[PDB]
Structures are given as structure tokens and as C-alpha cells.
Amino acid sequence: PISAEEQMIRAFVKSVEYMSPRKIGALVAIQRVRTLQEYISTGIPLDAKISAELLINIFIPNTPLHDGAVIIKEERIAVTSAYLPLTKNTGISKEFGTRHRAAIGLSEVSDALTFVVSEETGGISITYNGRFKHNLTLDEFETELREILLPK
Amino acid sequence: ISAEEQMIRAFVKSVEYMSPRKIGALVAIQRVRTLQEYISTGIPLDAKISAELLINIFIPNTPLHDGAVIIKEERIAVTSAYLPLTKNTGISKEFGTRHRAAIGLSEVSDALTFVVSEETGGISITYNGRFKHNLTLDEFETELREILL
């Protein structure tokens, strides 16, 4: 048996392994200490158990659920399609998109852990406490998730 | 506002999208007889029912789309579940594996199951050994309402 936190990290890694080489855009915000309820209220309610397969199905392009942010709360997908604050992007390379602006903006006003798969490049990135970590390998991505979510 | 009313609205809207697009769908609704043996074969979601989620689940060539969705107590309990296929012999070529699963489940349970054919977009329902096929959208909604409400 393995924890819900462990299962959730495994699901994130597997979903990103699928989405990145396919350049499927994804935006997943994980609530930590600071409540994300104000943003959850803007999404489509799922209140679903997390699996790699559901995360992939959510982000498949041109589906009712793929635009906007998935928000995770207490090891459940509370909503999809939530609206996150967008950071100002003066001077930012053209390669980054609205998903990166939403992840950075959320990290500037909360302690949430947010990750992005770029629709433009398939790049993997994470925001946390105002820091932007981009062009991660899958293994570096997993290491960041574990360091933050399992700070053992 | 009832859970049953909300669930029926979501079924109807999901089928309004899938039927003209010939998107195959297989949704089994637990009634009195428990479907736990089949739920155990699927991918756990335990999710609120919405038309948006039902549509997203069944999009072709996606991880969740193969197999049956099973509804339990007005949640999506699982997707991708295996149902028993009927051995009823006389079933036309028009009907495929989703239909045989719906028929097979109705033979051994009081579940209400509906199917959208991936070959024709046709809508059908199985319930208590009966097979109602080629329903119009309005006939489909009427059956759901008669059986579930």
C-alpha cells in the first residue's frame, strides 16, 4: 500500500509523460496552505479521485474540460477550467503562453504548487513561491514534486 | 434540483453531443442490485456527474473512453469497466460490443444501461432483459425519466 500523496505524484508524472511529447497543454494547481477556494469557485466541479488517465482525458484538446486550470485540493481534482490570475509578461519570450502566465500569477499570491505542459513546445515547468522552473526533464519534474509535496 | 433530475439532464446533454458525432458510449446505472464486481474492473473516479465530464470521458482514442462508465448513488464511480457480454444469439450486425455488454448486464442485474453506437450514433437502453433501440433523443429522455425518477 502507498499513500494518497504518493499515488497523486505518480499520476502527475505519468500524465506529463503522455502530454509533453504530444505538446498537449496542461495547467494543474495544487492547493497547499493558502486556500484556493476563490479560484475553485470559477471552475467546473468534478470532485474526482486523481488518476493519470483522468488528467490526460481532461487536457485532450477541443474538449469541454481542457481550457483553464485543474485545481487539486486534498488529493482530489476539485475542478477543471478554473481561472487563475495572470502575471504581467513584459519582455517574456514569445514561447511562453497563457498557461505560464496563470501559473506564475498564482505563485505570486499563494503557496500553491502549479505545473504546466506547454502547448507550444511540450516543455514542463513548475511554479512555487514566486519561482519559475522551466524546461524540466520528467525526472527533474518528479524531483521537484517530491521535494515540495513530500518534504521528508 | 434533485440529484436524479440533475443526473438525467447530464445524460441527455452528453448524448445530444455524442449521438450526431457517432461517439460510442456505454453508461450503466446501478439500481437495487449492486454492480461492485464490475466497478472493481474500472478506473476509479468517484466524480460528480456532469455532461462535460461524460463527454470528456468518451472522446475517442483517450485513456478513459474504452469500456463502461458505472454510475452509483449519483456519482461516476468508474470508467473503463468490463460488463458481461450476452450470449443471446439473435442480435443484428447493427449492434456491437457495447450493445452486447448492455444486454449482458441487464440479464444479471436491474441496472439501467444506455449506449450510443459508434457505428450509427443510435441510442439504446437495456433494463430488466428488455432492449429498446434506435430511440430518438426525446424517447431516450422519457425512458430515463420513467425508470429513474
Residue numbers in the entry:
A (entry chain B): 85 to 236
B (entry chain A): 86 to 234
Article, verbatim:
The synthesis of c-di-AMP is mediated by enzymes possessing a diadenylate-cyclase (DAC) domain.
To identify crystals suitable for fragment screening, CdaA enzymes from Streptococcus pneumoniae, Bacillus subtilis and Enterococcus faecium were purified and crystallized. However, suitable crystallization conditions for unliganded LmCdaA could not be identified.
